[PDB]
């Protein structure tokens, strides 16, 4: 009951953390190559706790000479679910994805090829620190909903890396672009002749992959053929040591939605179901920071699916769900901690916790504060240190 207001305030601080990071797939025109480039960061949960980050840089250039659509800057937003087929004995992965374009606030000939369900084949040959492997995958895509359903088999036996590290490499032409962004869909404009997709992926504190793929129609089927080379991986790191989680629970208790609704209400001060730049600004000032109008617009734009310039309740819930599913880096948890630890000493005092509360919404004269400190205070000093904070928040 005072643990309830940690959750509330914790979620709010986590929401502001989210709105200040860059989590989507960022796309920009590359006129020199008549294509596009992208960059983004992927988070892979480490089974025993922590996150393995994978930084991606990407380049796409058309295989043919027809004109292609070169986009304004925007992003793709991906939801992925990995599972296992219980009748499959081979090393494998079942993958369901939804991908939508956004990032531009309120139609090519190649888009015609994607109006129904299109079969897909994927073939990958890889070599990571000398361990070679192959993967084949098959399924279908339905661009109308930005949807993909595929099964992948390692045809060479055991995969020497974790399956989740290969998801990005294993057909963005299946993304759903909304009506007002059709002119930014490079991927389908290149079809049917297709495009070359190249990446380098840096796994932090570890090795990297370098990939080259050809994505084109062969007959009625959209085919993605890839080579991958990985080097400099550590034999006891998260990749070659198989320490990454396969299965993230797409949980969402009704309890969790209710707790997100509670944090949503700190931002949504007029109770209209949507967070405006004025509301988000109010909250951020009240926490000390002092952002311009432009920054507030960019923050909202990072999670604003419909492009209306506001974060509505369901867009907030989606954002909070992804933020809880994927582990934060140590730097990010430290930033959250700093919002409470105003003086920087490494310890949240009854006083510091009050300031943050007063300033954020809650009325709470000294008594309920004390109970909050006590609830989180493992070592008994009457203060909350980092490690106690980290435990409070899981």
131-149 burial, b at 16+ Cβ within 10 Å, e below that, comes to: eebebebebbbbbeebbbe
Q: Which is nearer to Ca ion, 219 or 380 (CB)?
A: 380
Query: Given candidates 72, 218, 270, 387, which one binds Ca ion under the rule CB under 5 A?
Result: 270
CB of 120 vs Ca ion, minimal distance in Å: 31
C-alpha dihedral sign at 135, 138, 142, 147: negative
Tokens of 239: 């990749």
CA angle 158, 161, 165 (to 5 degrees): 130
Binds Ca ion (CB under 5 A): choice among 97, 111, 302, 341: 341
Of the listed pieces 42-50, 123-131, 229-237, 268-276, which binds Ca ion according to CB under 5 A? 268-276
Q: Treating both helix axes as pointing N-terminal to C-terminal, what angle do 254-267 and 313-325 enclose, rounded to 10 degrees?
A: 120
Nearest approach, Cβ of residue 184 and Ca ion (Å):
18
Among 218, 255, 272, 293, binds Ca ion (CB under 5 A): 272
Q: Taking the complex as a whole, how short is the minimal distance between the CB of residue 347 and Ca ion, in angstroms? A: 5
Selected from 88, 218, 343, 387, the binder of Ca ion by CB under 5 A is 343
Q: Which is nearer to Ca ion, 18 or 216 (CB)?
A: 18
Closest to Ca ion by CB, 81 vs 338, is: 338
Give the span between the Cα atoms of 382 and 390, in whole angstroms: 17
- The structure tokens 């032409």 sit at 173
Rank residues 28 and 342 by Cβ distance to Ca ion and give the closer one: 342
Whichever of 206 and 352 has its CB closer to Ca ion, that residue is: 352
Q: For the CB of residue 128, give the shortest distance to Ca ion in the complex, in Å.
A: 41
Residue of 195, 210, 225 whose CA lies nearest to 120: 225
Contact indicator for 216, 193 with CB cutoff of 8 Å: yes
User: How far apart, in whole angstroms, are the C-alpha atoms of residue 99 and residue 97?
Assistant: 7
**Stretches 4-12, 145-153, 266-274, 318-326: which one binds Ca ion (CB under 5 A)?**
266-274
Rounded-to-5 percentages of helix, strand, coil across the chain: 30, 30, 35
Q: What is the DSSP string of 192-222?
A: TT-EEEEEEEEETTS-EEEEEEEEEEETTEE
Query: Does position 375 bind Ca ion by CB under 5 A?
Result: no
From the CB of 318, what's the least distance to Ca ion, in Å? 11
Q: Which of residues 297-336 bind Ca ion (CB under 5 A)?
A: 304, 306, 308, 310, 312
Buried b / exposed e along 237-274 (16+ C-beta atoms within 10 A): ebbbeebbbeeeeeeeeeebeebbbbbbebbbeeeeeb
Q: Rank residues 61 and 100 by Cβ distance to Ca ion and give the closer one.
A: 100
In whole angstroms, give the CA distance from residue 377 to residue 336.
17
Binding residues for Ca ion, rule CB under 5 A, total 17
Q: Which of 41, 377, 390, 393 binds Ca ion (CB under 5 A)?
A: 377
Write down the least CB distance from residue 141 to Ca ion, Å: 26
> Would you say 114 or 347 has its CB closer to Ca ion?
347
Site for Ca ion in 22-61 (CB under 5 A): none
Q: Kindly state the smallest distance separating residue 267's Cβ from Ca ion, in Å.
A: 8
**Cβ nearer to Ca ion, comparing 142 with 377:** 377
| 276: Cα within 13 Å, side-chain hemisphere | 7
Gaps in the chain (C to N over 2.5 angstroms) fall after 106, 170
- Pick the piece of the chain touching Ca ion (CB under 5 A) from 36-44, 65-73, 282-290, 374-382: 374-382
Positions touching Ca ion (CB under 5 A) are 268, 270, 272, 274, 304, 306, 308, 310, 312, 341, 343, 345, 347, 377, 379, 381, 383
């Amino acid at each position: 009951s005072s643990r309830r207001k940690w959750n509330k305030t914790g979620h709010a601080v986590r929401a502001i953390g989210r709105l200040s990071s860059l989590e989507n797939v960022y796309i920009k025109a590359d006129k020199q190559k008549n294509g596009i480039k992208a960059n983004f960061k992927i988070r892979h949960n480490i089974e025993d706790g922590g996150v393995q980050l994978a930084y991606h840089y990407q380049q796409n250039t058309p295989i043919g000479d027809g004109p292609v659509l070169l986009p304004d800057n925007h992003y793709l937003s991906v939801q992925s679910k990995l599972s296992k087929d219980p009748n499959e004995k081979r090393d494998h992965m079942v993958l369901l994805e939804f991908v939508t374009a956004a990032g531009i606030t309120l139609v090519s000939k190649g888009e015609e090829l994607f109006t129904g369900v299109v079969p897909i084949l994927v073939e990958l040959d890889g070599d990571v620190n000398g361990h070679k492997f192959s993967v084949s995958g098959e399924g279908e895509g339905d661009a109308t909903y930005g949807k993909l359903t595929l099964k992948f088999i390692c045809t060479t036996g055991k995969l020497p890396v974790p399956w989740p590290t290969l998801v990005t490499t294993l057909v963005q032409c299946f993304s759903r672009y909304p009506d007002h962004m059709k002119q930014h869909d490079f991927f389908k404009s290149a079809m049917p002749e297709g495009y070359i997709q190249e990446r380098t992926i840096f796994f932090k504190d570890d090795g990297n992959y370098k990939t080259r793929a050809e994505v084109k129609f062969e007959g009625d089927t959209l085919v993605n053929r890839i080579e991958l080379k990985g080097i400099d991986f550590k034999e006891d790191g998260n990749i070659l040591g198989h320490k990454l989680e396969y299965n993230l629970p797409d949980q969402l208790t009704e309890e969790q939605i209710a707790e997100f609704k509670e944090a949503f209400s700190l931002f949504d001060k007029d109770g209209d179901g949507t967070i405006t730049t004025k509301e988000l600004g109010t909250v951020m000032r009240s926490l000390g920071q002092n952002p311009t109008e432009a920054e507030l617009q960019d923050m909202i734009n990072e999670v604003d699916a419909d492009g209306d310039g506001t974060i509505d309740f369901p867009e907030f819930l989606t954002m909070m769900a992804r933020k809880m599913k994927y582990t934060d880096s140590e730097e990010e948890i430290r930033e959250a901690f700093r919002v409470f630890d105003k003086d920087g000493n490494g310890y949240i005092s009854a006083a510091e916790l009050r300031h943050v509360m007063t300033n954020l919404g809650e009325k709470l004269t000294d008594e309920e504060v004390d109970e909050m400190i006590r609830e989180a205070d493992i070592d008994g000093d009457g203060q909350v240190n980092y490690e106690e904070f980290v435990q409070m928040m899981t």
